[PDB]
């Protein structure tokens, strides 16, 4: 259930400079159980397929929603939109 | 929209060995008014009520039958120019392996 | 491939617009081929035996 409780750990990996861009936000999200369960039970996570396009765009929407929630909270800052 | 129109099913009170002329006129008027009804793929399943049972027969319109039923106006049981070359029985079979569904009208009901 | 790339929201919706344009183009293509099938359906209504017998009898 990480996709609903995401913003804390994304903020924490941003202050660690683990997540330095949104590409590394997806790359950090690939280490989770959420990535491993999005490909075996997709419709639990509002997915429509296990393909690389569906998985990559759902992860990218997840990260660009949580980082919009963190920049709108003024917790992080997004330059060049990336 | 994900599916294609495969024709229609209807019940019959009793088994006839031939397709009804009213059925081929109905099918050909539906075909002549709707271009999404391909005459190769659309059928008429007739579920005839035999004693204590149901006999199902699917029929297809031949291109002779679509032309005749399109031009036909005689709504009787024996209209002119109606031949058994106007239809061909097509293979239809049953299934436990998958399930279909139904669509009823939204505002009213069907009957 | 294996590693999922980040795609921006403008890039994601551009990919989705290009996808829905593709499948509305193949819906249009299938509909005009349906018209072609319909026009096609519409205007189609508008010694040796003895020598084999010899081999079989043998």
Swiss-Prot record, chain A:
Organism domain of life: Eukaryota
Free-text note regarding domains: Contains two helicase domains. The N-terminal helicase domain has catalytic activity by itself, contrary to the C-terminal helicase domain that may have a regulatory role and enhance the activity of the first helicase domain.
Record function comment: Catalyzes the ATP-dependent unwinding of U4/U6 RNA duplices, an essential step in the assembly of a catalytically active spliceosome. Plays a role in pre-mRNA splicing as a core component of precatalytic, catalytic and postcatalytic spliceosomal complexes. As a component of the minor spliceosome, involved in the splicing of U12-type introns in pre-mRNAs. Involved in spliceosome assembly, activation and disassembly. Mediates changes in the dynamic network of RNA-RNA interactions in the spliceosome.
Protein name (database record): U5 small nuclear ribonucleoprotein 200 kDa helicase
Portion of the full sequence shown: 1727 to 1808 of 2136
Subcellular location: Nucleus
Family, as annotated: Belongs to the helicase family. SKI2 subfamily.
Disorder association: Retinitis pigmentosa 33: A retinal dystrophy belonging to the group of pigmentary retinopathies. Retinitis pigmentosa is characterized by retinal pigment deposits visible on fundus examination and primary loss of rod photoreceptor cells followed by secondary loss of cone photoreceptors. Patients typically have night vision blindness and loss of midperipheral visual field. As their condition progresses, they lose their far peripheral visual field and eventually central vision as well.
Residues bearing the modification Phosphothreonine: 39
Source lineage: Eukaryota, Metazoa, Chordata, Craniata, Vertebrata
Tissue specificity note: Widely expressed.
Annotated organism of origin: Homo sapiens (Human)
UniProtKB/Swiss-Prot annotation, chain B:
Domain of life (superkingdom): Eukaryota
Organism of provenance: Homo sapiens (Human)
Assembly, per entry: Part of the U5 snRNP complex. Component of the U4/U6-U5 tri-snRNP complex composed of the U4, U6 and U5 snRNAs and at least PRPF3, PRPF4, PRPF6, PRPF8, PRPF31, SNRNP200, TXNL4A, SNRNP40, DDX23, CD2BP2, PPIH, SNU13, EFTUD2, SART1 and USP39. Component of the U5.U4atac/U6atac snRNP complexes in U12-dependent spliceosomes. Within the minor spliceosome, which acts on U12-type introns, interacts with PPIL2 and RBM48. Core component of U2-type precatalytic, catalytic and postcatalytic spliceosomal complexes. Found in a mRNA splicing-dependent exon junction complex (EJC) with SRRM1.
Name this polypeptide is given: Pre-mRNA-processing-splicing factor 8
Full protein stretch here: 2170 to 2280 of 2335
Disease in which the protein is involved: Retinitis pigmentosa 13: A retinal dystrophy belonging to the group of pigmentary retinopathies. Retinitis pigmentosa is characterized by retinal pigment deposits visible on fundus examination and primary loss of rod photoreceptor cells followed by secondary loss of cone photoreceptors. Patients typically have night vision blindness and loss of midperipheral visual field. As their condition progresses, they lose their far peripheral visual field and eventually central vision as well.
Domain note: The MPN (JAB/Mov34) domain mediates interaction with TSSC4 and SNRNP200. Has structural similarity with deubiquitinating enzymes, but lacks the residues that would bind the catalytic metal ion.
Tissues where the protein occurs: Widely expressed.
Subcellular location: Nucleus; Nucleus speckle
UniProtKB/Swiss-Prot annotation, chain C:
Post-translational modification: In vitro phosphorylated by CLK1 and U1 snRNP-associated protein kinase. Phosphorylated by SRPK2 and this phosphorylation is required for its association with the tri-snRNP (U4/U6-U5 tri-small nuclear ribonucleoproteins) and subsequent spliceosomal B complex formation. May be phosphorylated by SRPK2 on Ser residues in the SR domain; the phosphorylation is required for the removal of inappropriate R-loops during transcription.
Gene name of the record: DDX23
Family to which the UniProt record says this protein belongs: Belongs to the DEAD box helicase family. DDX23/PRP28 subfamily.
Protein name as annotated: Probable ATP-dependent RNA helicase DDX23
Oligomeric and partner information: The phosphorylated form (by SRPK2) is a component of the U4/U6-U5 tri-snRNP complex composed of the U4, U6 and U5 snRNAs and at least PRPF3, PRPF4, PRPF6, PRPF8, PRPF31, SNRNP200, TXNL4A, WDR57, SNRNP40, DDX23, CD2BP2, PPIH, SNU13, EFTUD2, SART1 and USP39. Identified in the spliceosome C complex. Interacts with ERBB4. Interacts with ERCC6.
Compartments where found: Nucleus; Chromosome
Function comment: Involved in pre-mRNA splicing and its phosphorylated form (by SRPK2) is required for spliceosomal B complex formation. Independently of its spliceosome formation function, required for the suppression of incorrect R-loops formed during transcription; R-loops are composed of a DNA:RNA hybrid and the associated non-template single-stranded DNA.
